[PDB]
Amino acid sequence: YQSGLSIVM
Amino acid sequence: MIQRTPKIQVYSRHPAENGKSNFLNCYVSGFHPSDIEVDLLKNGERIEKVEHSDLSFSKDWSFYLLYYTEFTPTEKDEYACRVNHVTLSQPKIVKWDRDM
């Protein structure tokens, strides 16, 4: 699994 | 906010034979949003202990779920799947057809 880094905005 | 009404398929795991234990399957797919109510009915009332798959979605982002219970098919008992969605005004009851 890989978690997100930057948020959508 | 896409809203997709669910396709509903009621079928058995193996070819239905009277007195032979089998699995009743209700497959709901192609629906958005994820929030959905699915029940399995024997003779119009609600079968307890209906398992369902972990929620997942197809390649178009539309969700799919499988609801299943163990049943023994017989001619006099009628099995159905009851589905309620934001898209449905009232719960939709799909009868089980042994040729589908």
Binding site: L5 | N25, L66
Partner: protein, 275 residues
């Protein structure tokens, strides 16, 4: 080829609690892991028997990444709702699909990192794994941010490394079952719909993998214009079912043939009705 896929659904429930966070993992057409926020103890769980071998260090790392992603979607849901000027009460869904495809050699074929907001395409990583495709004006803002931050490099590094490495490992753990194919058990059923016509139904049952081709082809018609085709459906034992039906004039049923293509069948099935 083989595929590793994660399907992530985040649904906000304003006034009812924190957003529901669900992540399901699939190797090919087999589901092997699940994370669901509403479980009594939310943690990654095995949904395949071959995964019960994994030690705690696998599960703890997976669960932490799931819990980390949960905060990501909680923020991103809030960020989206405010940008779109949506009502605070409204429930909204964020969907994410990511994974990798390996070829014959078991080296990466394609990497996927895609998002949908409220059931519509939002942003997707292109096949190059370096640039983004934006669905709407909001995603174009996400794209400029992710371009500057270098998010594509962060995701590509996983898709090119851990994703393929763990796909091959999952294939090792469940090899005796995952690499198997079950050829469809196919038959034609004859139901006389009227006094003028009959419905012919071609069944394909108990087959794995899920991909299949069912066509009724009359006189060599490649396919049929008026044919009912149902969606491929799970039997619940790891195998799938599909059927194709045509309505044909009475007495001409033997002209119609059903053809089945599957990974299990080196040669296609040709099915005909015989009473």
């Amino acid at each position: 080829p083989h595929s590793l896929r994660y399907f992530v659904t985040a649904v906000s429930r304003p006034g009812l609690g924190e957003p529901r966070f669900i992540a399901v993992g699939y190797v090919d057409d087999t589901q092997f892991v699940r994370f669901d926020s509403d479980a009594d103890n939310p943690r990654f769980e095995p949904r395949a028997p071959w995964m019960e071998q994994e030690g705690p260090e696998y599960w703890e790392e997976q669960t932490q990444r799931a819990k980390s992603d949960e905060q990501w979607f909680r923020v991103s849901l809030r960020t989206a709702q405010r940008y779109y000027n949506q009502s605070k009460g409204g429930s909204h869904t964020f969907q994410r699909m990511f994974g990798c495809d390996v070829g014959s050699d078991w080296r990466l074929l394609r990497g996927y990192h895609q998002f949908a907001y409220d059931g519509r395409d939002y942003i997707a990583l292109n096949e190059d794994l370096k640039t983004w495709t934006a669905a709407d004006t909001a995603a174009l803002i996400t794209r400029r941010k992710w371009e500057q931050a270098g998010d594509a490099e962060y995701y590509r590094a996983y898709l090119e490394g851990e994703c393929v490495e763990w796909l091959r490992r999952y294939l090792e753990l469940g090899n005796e079952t995952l690499l198997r194919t079950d050829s469809p058990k196919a038959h034609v059923t004859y139901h006389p719909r009227s006094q003028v016509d009959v419905t012919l139904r071609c069944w394909a049952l108990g087959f794995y993998p899920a991909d299949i081709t069912l066509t009724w082809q009359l006189n060599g018609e490649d396919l049929t214009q008026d044919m009912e085709l149902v969606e491929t459906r799970p039997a619940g034992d790891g195998t799938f079912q599909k059927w194709a039906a045509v309505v044909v004039p009475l007495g001409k049923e033997q002209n119609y043939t059903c053809h089945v293509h599957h990974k299990g069948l080196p040669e296609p099935l040709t099915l005909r009705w015989k009473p």
